[PDB]
Design an enzyme around this catalytic site. Structure first.
Site: not given
Ligand SMILES: NCc1ccc(Cn2ccc3cc(C(N)=O)cnc32)cc1
Ligand SMILES: NCc1ccc(Cn2ccc3cc(C(N)=O)cnc32)cc1
Lengths: 248, 248
Positions: B99, B126, B164, B172
């Protein structure tokens, strides 16, 4: 269902996916696996393939107006949804994951965690018919501004993030709305790099303050826009000012 | 390695995870599964558990300065990283998911997709020692402003999104930097809701224009800030103006 673990605030999450076996990544491992085994968390899947009647079990259909891609075939997806809602009862909010959705952030994770019952609809291909969003979907959410090969990983990300808000699942998260402080563990010295002495000091209050100052410096340097959403405390304004002055 | 599928731009992605079997959700299913089988995409995992020497295979360690949580034990994580880099050779960029990282968006997915070789380090507990970020991590990335139970789902999301961009993986994505138009498939009428006639019309150019207008209306109504990043085309300014006028 039975066992000894307080499951007062337990969550039930239905899933509609053509790839239900992907959800094993969350239901059979680690903290989410423990939540499932201790009945803090229940993930139940339905596969639209199972709601087909044709010999080949078609789950995709051609877009009206032409285009490159397929959509999810309406009848088997509509039926899978209706079966998941019947299993769930009154209450269950239905979520479509998509890039057109409300952007997920931790605030949104805690709203979503108030529901005792979610149904997560995972789209494949270029997505699902707009009329099903209108008539079956309560809320549309994105995990972020990127396109993936389906909704499963979005749905799994949503499940894992809400599971953390289920009392008993953990054994803080954007503490204070800020990025995390640096952490250190053994050894004391690593490639000539040492642990900040303050962290060895024993003084809990000088350590609280160093971590908070570091969080503010790190939010400031990397995600300044995150400060704008906050009414900082008097202590926080003071530690931020100091960190900014030690930068310059 | 062998086969007939053009794999000109193939990608190799190393993974450091205590839960390598989670990556089966991407390597054994759907489009990402096809990429792996056709040698467009290779995901190779190392488990820090395997780099332990103690009887119980300890992979966590206590934070210096006290706190609620554990961190990843340095020695087995450091060793797993060094083994992944040796396997990879020169070139391999190492990513820590967290994060505190750069926010992933599709633009960032296409930068990350330029690398022929990634190593994705998945943190549990953590997180990991700051000194390893300093000495082992090229880049830190977040999939979004939410906390999860580990880096695996972030790493899987990153893999799927970069896959992809591998020529041959699709069969697209924020087309033009805008949200997607509505899609329709069978049937013509669904719960008294009909498909826009234009989509039945056959006229490819009136359909191109309706979809683009709808994308602009939908970006405008849901993600106005996404318009601010764009220099709209003359056609796009005209369709946006029109959609705004049909709203009011
Ligand atoms: N036509 C455009 C198109 C939309 C979505 C996808 C695949 N996809 C399905 C659900 C979803 C969530 C996310 C996200 N960001 O939550 C991303 N891709 C997703 C492929 C093509
Ligand atoms: N101490 C704070 C703490 C940080 C991270 C985690 C678990 N976590 C590991 C990698 C990662 C990516 C994300 C994201 N948003 O990419 C989220 N959570 C993640 C748990 C606690």
């Amino acid at each position: 269902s039975s066992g000894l673990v307080p499951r007062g605030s337990h969550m039930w999450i239905g899933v509609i996916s053509l790839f239900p076996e992907m959800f094993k990544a969350i239901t059979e491992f680690g903290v989410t696996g423990r939540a499932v085994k201790h009945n803090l968390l229940k993930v139940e899947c339905w596969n639209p393939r199972d709601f087909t009647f044709d010999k080949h079990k078609t789950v995709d259909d051609r877009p009206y107006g032409g285009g490159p891609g397929m959509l999810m075939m309406v009848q088997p997806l509509r039926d899978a949804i209706h079966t998941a809602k019947a299993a769930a009862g009154e209450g269950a909010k239905v979520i479509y994951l998509s890039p057109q959705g409300r952007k997920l952030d931790q605030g949104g994770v805690t709203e979503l965690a108030q529901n005792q019952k979610l149904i997560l609809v995972c789209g494949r291909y270029e997505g699902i018919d707009e009329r099903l969003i209108q008539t079956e979907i309560d809320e549309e959410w994105s995990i972020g501004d990127y396109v993936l090969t389906g909704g499963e990983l979005p749905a799994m990300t949503l499940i894992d993030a809400v599971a953390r808000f289920i009392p008993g699942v953990l054994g803080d998260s954007f503490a204070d709305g800020l990025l995390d402080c640096p952490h250190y563990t053994r050894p004391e010295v690593l490639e000539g790099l040492t642990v900040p002495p303050v962290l060895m000091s024993g003084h809990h209050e000088e350590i609280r303050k160093w971590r908070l100052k570091q969080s503010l410096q790190r939010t400031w340097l990397r995600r300044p826009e995150l400060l704008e959403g906050l009414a900082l405390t008097d202590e926080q304004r003071k530690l931020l000012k100091e960190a900014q002055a030690e930068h310059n």
